[PDB]
Structure formats: structure tokens, C-alpha cells
């Protein structure tokens, strides 16, 4: 016994090959996934429930692996994810792929370093290629938006709720940009809260200014209704809390007990009128609510809701703009709710909801969805999270691209100028990246069913012509289709990271030599 | 006679120790040069980690073997000490250690085989010191490029290593340090880099100043901070106890609200007076209560909890603020002066992979360097940091011996032959051990080759020829030369080439490989024992 | 690379020990097998007792049937044990010290191990050593050739062998048993006399003085009918095969009787036959029949009718012991008998030797005989089988001896002289050899040490004196009193022994140790 007692090794061409393989598994179990004439897959969780999901990541997501590059793959899917939302729908396809003709040169004998080469040196090329037929657009036009908004989404369900989803993304994240940054501002997407209800129709499902309570009013009297509602977030409970220093009282003539007991309610009066002295309408606490408090609030006119998730309430608090506090006696004015066009309690059904809209410039807001069932409305959401996530992206770039292979192919042929250009052992690895990359219109055409090969070569051969870049393929017809009159645009970083990534891949994987196991710590 | 186990002794063990030698070399063998192929673990349940760096490898390794150990163990001081080398330093010790025994696997007289191999060691790093070029005369920018990307072949990131190093030297130039008065002392770690999930290495960016792991304290409080007012402060910021045992026993009721009252307005004025001041930037390792941050934001100004110690000792150091652990005086109030501020012209978290991390931007007080790394998965980043990490070690140790090494395996290539002929000078049995530890030197550009497939004895011979060659007619300045290469399979002017490693690496390594090919070999017969 | 292989199966359980080490494992066995035996040498010496794996028991002072009996484990331990074997049927007891020349020898062989001496050199030396010892030896070899008839040679030389063993009871009257036992049986032509001319026969019963060799042969077989008389004078001698049956050619035979007068015939042939060879036997004049198989138990009658004794189911080798003795013939044939082919002998006549139990026949033959038959008597079952071996081995000596009629005072006086006469070589040695002569010379000293241990007296004090004496004087006629007589003059003590013995002894001792010395290397597969 010599080395680590039960822990396997591996080594060379078997190890490369192993890590293809599995690499080429990794990608075919989704080529059906994409397009617009894609495949909708459910899956089986580990805990019971149901989850249907186009977007390959989530399926990935919920992939148990050992082969490792594999596990290293399904990394990959999410971080791009992460960063891009769709895509995924072909990210990890093409890397798979660009391994696949990858591996064919490694029989040649050819040292993968090398040919590593070659792949940074197509990428800048691509990357450079991609920005040169890049295309800028303006941003405060709204329709070219949705249209580059339905296009990165006629590809999930929601293609039939285009329309609203185009507006339901627009509008969502037209109203997120925080321009204290000055002409820097953010949005973020972690405010454009999702609120999944069941019953009601997609159609019903709408974007509401402002943010939704599941909760109910503490007390009756409170209206659960008000024109002009004026706001405080409680941080702090509204209740008596312990002396945090341990301290004990020793009373020795009758009264103080009660005397005490009176202190504490007055401690509670004391913080109520602090409250009124502001001349709120609502009270808003992340915690508990006296409900002796909550008695003087009733003598207040003044409704309040209790135990509140903190992310909603800094969301209610970047709703009416107004501040969060935990200090009733420091409250401030500034920190009114002023900017809450109404305030309302209704009934889904069983559950009180709170609605919160028509501030007068609301930065945040939560989308209610209404529709089938949770998980149908988790897959909406889902296709809701990157509907939302390329828009922003857009916000970041004005640039697009037509994607669809179209771009691909101008990609490829530019390369192929390089490559007859570019003599050299490279040449053939730089003419394989070529070559790889035409297999995602490839699965198109296997997604739409028609000849691959056909369409393929007379899409190649249209595209040797320079007068025209737009020629890409309708997802129906499986036809060739210049993309300016189809409309299926593209922003340009999607492609980007998608290209980024995707060589990472390789080099990552192609630098792997051996395996070991059993690490036992 | 012991009881819970037997022993092994003379040529069985002695032989038990040289597979355990060469089978950590065979372990590692194909890690090395710049076309080292990197090592990946699965761990036990998927937590895999690729590697090419072996220290790391071997740190993560299971070993029961007590020998690999020592070579596991040898390589951490190396790695404790360079960085790379890691690339070499462990096949070079137990192939020193595969020739030496053979002598011995005859009758040679282990200690006979050690004196020279302490002669062999001294013998060379003399010469190498004959042999070393200096590079202050070089511009300094070049070499530094040169070794660093020189050190960034067998690496992940060779191929964009123009991009890499230029960005390193300048990191690295940034984290300029003068020492004991008398050294400009470079800190290793000083440079902040964090890992950073998504673009490419391309887009991943060097940091101007600090960056941070950190978040906003509260979503509220503001984000980006244009100016240089900016605190820390150890002390965490809690509603204060008692703190030791101080019990709270109350008689007089009507004083528990204003007990209850102070605190917090203990924690208050801190604040205010901590506010009054002006710093905006308050950082605390400690916790942070809200009640602080309602004020802070209510100040408009900006908190941090719970940074770790390292981070904002190195911001104190940049920003020329003042570590605070808690606000007292050289008499007894608790005061803050602004003295105690630093100064970085802006602060700002911003969204990185979804993640908003924040950043600190030109120090005016000392210049910072932090790097930011892009890729695509944790595994691509996390194990490119540590060539990163050795990254800088090698430029600290150019930067700290004003000295270089000729890369590609020159080294050995005029060191086999030079104590071969040095070998006839002992003319004691000894230089048997010379003739195989220049011998057994040769292993490297063997290694390289193999990794690289090509003709190693014939490039090896070629290798051999011309460093021998240049070791006829003295006019050597006209005859004496330096280089290898493996992408063209040819050996060339790596001196022309710029392939250069730092002259320490060498050194300690085959000082570090003479220890422990003297510890090894002196070994005759193990015992084990069963536990308990 | 490291990872791990198969050469050989069970590799796992193949362990292996190698040089010294190993060397001295062996040695270490070896002492424990030395110091087994060095009890059972000498007068003075005690015997073991061996238990069996079917619960039988053995006492003995034999060594090789002290090993024979032992169940070792360890290789070279068999080794010794077929080695005293191979010495006990090569030539007798001294086998009651042979291995313990062998590994005193190894013990001592270590000391020049522990000296890291090689062992091939050690394998040499003690060789040139043993030759050194024989050829001093029978420079200082007595003889027996030189006797007259060798009557009391002899008697002390198997009055010595007997002292080693427990029938020393009355071993004086063994000793001459054996001595003519010997004596008759002997080819002086040749030089050598067949043991199966010995019928040793031991029934247990009476006192060991009982013991008495019969100049015939004794029979563990009654009458062959009853009432036939238990003694017969005359022994005019039948030796038969065929037994009294009608003849049956054994070649698929049978008949097919068909009518009256064929079943008639056969039933007058049936009887007619056993009178003709009743007719037949009666006219050879014989006295007495013997026959190796059965009998019909009518003509049985009909034998005894005509008072003509035989003896039926008589094992094969003692019929010819029988017949030799008698000078007799075997005929298979009643027809082909006659009377010249009819045994003679001076008594026969059946005892019953037990008190309570079925009888033995004996026959007292007269004239000369080159078969013999002892017959033993005592009080023990192994008693009788420790007499056999003992006076099996006291035999062989005197063959050893008629081989050899030279000879040398025993009681360890003889290699006594060898070690000084090794010794005096040892300083014409030169070099390492040197050290190995001393190196056996010591080994071969213990010897003596043995038997004055066994005698309980401080055995160097009696050695260390000894030497000086056959230093001082120049007999070589000096060895231990064992009994405790203030001579050491051994002969006139009369302590004797053949050249041979010790000559194969040491000499095989050397051969073995060789191989001991040469092997360094073991893989023993796990149990």
C-alpha cells in the first residue's frame, strides 16, 4: 500500500476521451431544448415536487453528476445564466460541440496547448468580428424593445403572452434605474419582486405600480382601502422588548409592581404619539405589533401590518421612496409615506393581499402573476427572469446582433478568410472553430425538422456572399431568411459571454490530463 | 521483536522508499515546462480542484507513505518559498534520489554517496552564481514580463499572459514598500484578488487601489462615494452590555427607561461623534446594529460589517486612515480625530456576477493593487489565482534579488556537464555520486519533452553538445550560450527568447532536494506499529 | 509506477525471511533441537517418551525414533530428523549424540557469523576440519581385526552399546544374545549379514532376563488341530505352499457335471485325493508338515490320523526362516516332494508362554542354521519395543563391525584427541580458517560436556583436566568416568567403538551443517 489506499487514478488519451464523452453527453441530452420550435422538458426533483422548464440551466440545475468536467459544465451553465439568462438555451451545446471536432485533432497527435492557441486567437477574432456587424439602437423607443423582447423570448411558452410579457418586461424594468449614481444609475433586479398566485389567466397577470403584502390587517377597524396613504417602516418591534443586560428588580413596597406594569404601557403611549405627532396613515413593522399599541394605532386611525420579510419592506421603502426606520422617537418627516397613489386589502381568494400602487415615480414594484398553477407560473417567472434580464442588458449596450446562426456563419466564413490567411498547423484548429460553430443552426433545422444539410450548405453558400449578413433561418419555415424583415434580435453581450464562455470551456477541459479520487478530508 | 507490527530492512525497504519517490514523480511528471498539463482531484463527493501547481496537488493528496510525505512536506517550504518549481522541484529531489540509490542498489556507501552530494550541491550554486545574469541593466518592465510570463507557460494562463503579466508587473510595481530602511521590501498578499465567476480573463481587471468582498450594510444607505472621508473602526457597534458581569438590580423603577434610554445613546453618540467628524466610510470586522445604520443613513453615510482583520489593515495601510479598535484617548474620554481618517478618491460596491462587491479607488496615501479575475467557472478562477498568487512571489523574489535565471532548463544543461569534468577533480570514489547526480540532473528537459513528445535523448544530446560546446575555446563570449524551446522542438537563445526564472528558484530548490535526498537516503529500515 | 502488483499468488501470504537473520532463525531451531537431544546421550543419560496422534505413547532413548516420532513444523528441523535416520540405518545409536555434534557446531558457526564471517568460507573450513578428524582418527584407531575369535570384543562392544539404554538391566546377557545371535548369521566371506536372518521376536510377559534368543525359529502359530501333540522329538519336516485343498488351476476353470457316475466320481475323487497326497506325504517320511495356507478340515483330521503335526496359515518369510534353518525346501507339489527336500531340526515344540492367552510353537533346531530368532520376555509392551530397537541397533554394530574390525575406545576420548589434533593444525592454519578451526574444534568439545552433565559433575573441570592428561600423556585411551570410576583409562574401562560410527557420524555431521551453512533464503507459503 503506497499512494492513497483506494483512491483511483487516471491518465491520458483514455482521460481526454473520458472527458469528451462526457462532455458530448452533457450537450445532446438538451440539443432538442432550443429554438422556437424547441422542446419543453419536466423534471423529477429530489424532494417531490414538479418542475417544467425550457431554459436548460434550471435543467442542469437539477443534475446530479460524478464525472467531474461534467460537474464542471453545469457550473458553467448557470454563471452565464447568471450573467446572461437565455443562451443557455445553446451555451453549453456549443461548447460541447467545439470540444467535439476538439478532441478530433487530438488523435493528430497534436498537443492541446496549441491548439489552445488557436482558440484565444479565434476568439479575439470573433470578438472583433461580432462588434464590427454589431448593430446600435436607440433605447427610449419602446416597440423595438419588445420586439427584441419577444424575440429573446419566442423561444419559451410565453410566446403566446408575448404582447403582455413585451409590456410586463418593459414597463417592469423601464421604472428600475437608481440615478443617485448620477448619470450612472443601476437597476437591479433583485426589487422587480415576482408574486405567483394561483387561479386567473395569464391575461390576468399584470404589472402593478408598487409592491403586494400577503398579509391581512392586524386589527378590523384599520380601512383596507385609502386614496393617499402616508407610510412609516417600523424596523424596530413595536412592543416592549427585554433590558438586553440582564436586569432584575427587586421591589419592596407594594405599588411598583403594578407601577412597573404601568411603565411599559406607557413606554408603549410613549412611542405611539411620536408616531401620530408625523401624522402617519400606515405602520409598517418587519416584526410583532403590540397590539396594545395596535389598540392607540386603532385610536389613531392609523392601520399597521406587522411581521414583514425585510427584502419586501426595503422595496415598500423604495416604492414611496420613503426611508426605513427603527427609532420612533428619531422618525423624520422626510421619511413619510408620500408617493402611495392607494392603498388596498383585498381577497385573491382565501388570502388577504395589500395593494400598494400609483406612486407618483416608483422605482421599485412586484409583479403579480396569475395563472395556471405555481409551477406553471415558476416556469413563467422563469421565463419572466431573463425576459427581464437581457432588457437591462440592453440598458447596459444599445448594440444587437442577429443571432438565429446568421451571425454565426458571418462569423465563420470571416474566420475562413483568416485561416487560408493564416498558414500554419493552427490553420486546420482555426478552421475547426469554423466549422464547429455551425452546428447551432444546425440543431434549428433539427429543431424545425426539415434538411439539415440542404438548408445548411445553401445557408453557407448564401452567406459567401459579403453584400449580405442578415441571412439567417426562420424557425417555422426552416427556410433562409434575411433577419432584418424576420426581427429576431439579439443584444450583443449575450453573444458575447456566450463566446466567452464557451471557449473557457475548452482550455479548461482540454488541459485535463488525469484523474484522482478519494480525497477524504 | 514488537508487537504491533514488523520491519523492514536493507535493500527491501531501501528499494520500499525509491517506488514511493518515483511513483510521487509519476504523480506529478506531466505538470511541468510550458506544455505542463494541469492535475484535477475529485475529491470524495464531487468538490473536484483542478491543478497543475503540485504543492497544492500534493497538499491535497492523501499520503500514508512516510517518505512522500517528506517530499509532500518539501515541496510547501518550496511552495512556502517560490511558488513554482512546484513545476520541478519534487521530480528533481527523488530522481536525485532514483540514481543515488542505484549506487547504492550495488554496495556504495550511502554516507560516500552523501559528501559528494553535499559537494554537488555547493559545487553548483557557486558556478551558478558564475553563471547568474543580472537585470538592472535590463529594462526592468522586460524581464519582469519576461519571467513572470516565462512563469505563466504551464499555466492556464500562458496563452494571455502579454495581457497577464503587464498587468501583473503593474500590480505588483503599484505595491512598491520600503523596508527596514535599507530594503524597498515588496509584501507578498498585499495585492487583493478575488474570484469573480463570468467574462474572460481579457475583461477580468487589475484594481487601481482596494477592492472588497464586502456589501452594503444597508440597502438603503447610499453606495457610491465620490470623496475621501472614509473611517474604520474595529470596535463593533452594538446596543452596549454590561459586558463583564455587571448585574442591573432595580429598587427605583422609575429609571429603568432611562437606563433602557442610555443603551443605546451610548452607541449614539459614538456615532455622532464618530459622524462629527465628517468620515462617511466607516468599515467594522466587528458586528453592526441597524440602529447605526438608520443614523448612517440618516448621516447618508456609509458602513461595512463584518470585513475581515487583513483587508482593512491593508486599507489602513493604503489610505493612510488610522486602525481603531475602539475610541478612547491618552486621557479618558473616548474622542476620534480626524487625523485617523484615510483618503481613496472614490468607494463605491458595484454588481459583479449578480454580486455587488465594493471597491476603494486611489489611496492618495499609499497605492493599492487588487485584481479582479473573470472566468467561467469557480474551477477556472480559484485554481488561476494560485498561479497568480505564485504570479507575483516569483516578480517579489525578481524584484528582491536583482538577479536572473536563464528559463528552459538551461540550468542543468551546464550544470551536468560542468561538475561531470569537476567529477574528475574529487578522484575519490565520490564523483560516481556527481557523474549520477549531474546524471540524474538531466531529468527536466527529459520531462519537458515527453509532455511535449518529441526526440528528448537527440534534443537532449543537441542540449548537451552545445552547453558543452560552450564549454571548449574559451572565448566563450562568442561561444557561450544559453536556451532550449519544446514549441519548436529546438533548442534556442531562451536568453533571446526571454524564457527566465528567478536564480533563487534553482537555488533553493537543489539545496531544498540535498536535505532531503540526505535525509532519504540515510534511511536502512522501517517499523511500523499497528494502533492501539 | 507505484501501485501494487502480483507476482506470485497469495503473495499476501508468502512470507519470506533472507540472510542472516534467516541464518540465525535457523540456528536458533537448531539449538532447541540440540537441546532436545543432549538428555538422551550416555549412561548417564535420560530417554524421552512420544506420544501419538492416535493417543499411543512412545518411551524411547533413540533418537532417530525420538525424531522419527516428532511432529515438527519447521523445515529444517526435518532436516535433522530424516538426518538421524539417515545416520541411525547407516550405522546405530550415536545417533544418541549426532545432532548434537550438528548444531553445537551451528551454534558456536553463528558466534563466526556474528563475526560477519561469510558462510562459504565456514563451510570450507569445518570440511578441511572433518578430514583433519578422520585422518587422526585412525592413525589412533585400535582394531579388532587383530583379535582372535572375536568372542569378547565384541561382548564389551555390545556391553557398551547396551549401557546407553534402559535393558542395561541385565544387558550382559544381551550383549552375548546378540554376539552369537551375530555370529551365526555372519558371511565372514563377505563382510556382511542380512538382518532378515534375524527373527526378532518379543511377546510381552516374564522378567526382561526371561529375554532369550532361540538358535531356531519360534512360531506365533498353535497346532493346526487340537488334539495333535504339543511336542515333537524327531523333526522330519514337511515346508508346504499348496494348501490341503483339491488343486484349482486358476486359470478360468470349472466343470460341468451332467450325470450320476460324474457326480460320483468326483465325490470318490473328492475324498481319494486327500488320501493320495495323505498317502504321499506319509511316504516321504516326514514327521511334521507345515503349510503356508489352509487346510480342509477332514484331511486335517486324517493328518492328524496318521500322527504327521502341520502347521497351517504360516506367514510367508518366517516359512523360509524355517526352511534355511532346517536347510529345508519349499515344494509346491505333493508328487514332486521327497524326502531329501524334508526339513530337519534338532526340537520343535509349541509354549504356552502366556499365563492365560492361546500359545506360540518354537523350534529347537540342532544343527547349523543361517537363520536365528531371539525371543523377548519382559514386563512392558514398550519395554519389549524399547528392547527391540536397542538390541535391533546393538546388531547392526557388530555388522558395522564385521564391515570394520578396527575399533576405538569410546567415553569421548576419541575426538577429545581430534580437537587437540585440530587444534595443533589450527596454528598451521594461516588465515580466516584459522579461525574457523578453533571455531569447530570448540564445536566439537561439547560432546563430553554432554556426558559429564548427564554424570552431574562440573563437566569443564572434567574436561579441562581430561585434555591436560591426554595432554599430558599421549594415550588417546582417556574419557569420561562415567560411572564413577576413578579410571579414565576407558580401555580398560572397556568403553569401545568402532571407527565407522564416529567416522559417518562427524563426517555426515559435516555434509549436512554444509548445506546448513549454504542456504540463506526462505519463502514460506502461509498456512
Redesign the interface.
Known sequence: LVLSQNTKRESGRKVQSGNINAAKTIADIIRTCLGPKSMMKMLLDPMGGIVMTNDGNAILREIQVQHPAAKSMIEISRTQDEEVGDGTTSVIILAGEMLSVAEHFLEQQMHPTVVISAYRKALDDMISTLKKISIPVDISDSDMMLNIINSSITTKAISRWSSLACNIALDAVKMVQFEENGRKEIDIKKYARVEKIPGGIIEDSCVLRGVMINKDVTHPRMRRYIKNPRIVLLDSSLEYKKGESQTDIEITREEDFTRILQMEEEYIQQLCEDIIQLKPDVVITEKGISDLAQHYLMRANITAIRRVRKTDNNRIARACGARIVSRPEELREDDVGTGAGLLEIKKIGDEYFTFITDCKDPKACTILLRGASKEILSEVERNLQDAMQVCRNVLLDPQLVPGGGASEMAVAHALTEKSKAMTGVEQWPYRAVAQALEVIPRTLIQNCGASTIRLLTSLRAKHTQENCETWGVNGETGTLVDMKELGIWEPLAVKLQTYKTAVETAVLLLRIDDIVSGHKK | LSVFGDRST?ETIRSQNV??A???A??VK?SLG??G????????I?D?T?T?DGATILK??????PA?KVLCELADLQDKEVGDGTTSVVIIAAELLKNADELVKQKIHPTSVISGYRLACKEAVRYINENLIVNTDELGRDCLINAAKTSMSSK?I???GDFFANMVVDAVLAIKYTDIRGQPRYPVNSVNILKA????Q??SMLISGYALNCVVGS??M???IVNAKIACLDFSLQ?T??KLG??????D??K??Q??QR?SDITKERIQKILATGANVILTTGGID??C???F??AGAMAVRRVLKRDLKRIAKASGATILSTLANLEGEETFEAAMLGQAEEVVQE?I??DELILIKNTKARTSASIILR??????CDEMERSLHDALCVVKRVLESKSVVPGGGAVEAALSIYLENYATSMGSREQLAIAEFARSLLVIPNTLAVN??QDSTDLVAKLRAFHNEAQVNPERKNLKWIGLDL?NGKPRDNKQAGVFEPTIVKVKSLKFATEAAITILRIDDLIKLHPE | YGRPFLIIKDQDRKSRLMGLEALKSHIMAAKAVANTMRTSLGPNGLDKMMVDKDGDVTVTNDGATILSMMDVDHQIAKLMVELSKSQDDEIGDGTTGVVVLAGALLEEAEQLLDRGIHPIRIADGYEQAARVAIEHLDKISDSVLVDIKDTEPLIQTAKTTLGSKVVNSCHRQMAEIAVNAVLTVADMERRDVDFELIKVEGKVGGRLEDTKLIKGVIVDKDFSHPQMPKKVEDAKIAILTCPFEPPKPKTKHKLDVTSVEDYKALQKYEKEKFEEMIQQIKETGANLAICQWGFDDEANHLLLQNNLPAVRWVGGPEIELIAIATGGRIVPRFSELTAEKLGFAGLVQEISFGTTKDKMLVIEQCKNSRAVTIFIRGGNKMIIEEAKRSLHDALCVIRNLIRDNRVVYGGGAAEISCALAVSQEADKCPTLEQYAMRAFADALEVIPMALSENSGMNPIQTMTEVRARQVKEMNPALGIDCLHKGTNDMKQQHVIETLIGKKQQISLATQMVRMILKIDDIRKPGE
Do not use: W
Open positions: 536493507g517506488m514511493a518515483a511513483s510521487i509519476n504523480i506531466s510550458p506544455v498539463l494541469d492535475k484535477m482531484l475529485v475529491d470524495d464531487g473536484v483542478i497543475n491535497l493528496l492523501e499520503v500514508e507513505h512522500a492556464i500562458g496563452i494571455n465567476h463570468g467574462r474572460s481579457m475583461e440597502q438603503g447610499p453606495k457610491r446596543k452590555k454590561m455587571v448585574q442591573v438590580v432595580i429598587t423603577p422609575e429603568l427607561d437606563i433602557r443603551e441597524d440602529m445604520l438608520k443614523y443613513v440618516e454588481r456576477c449578480d472566468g467561467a467557472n469557480d474551477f477556472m511535449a513528445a514549441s
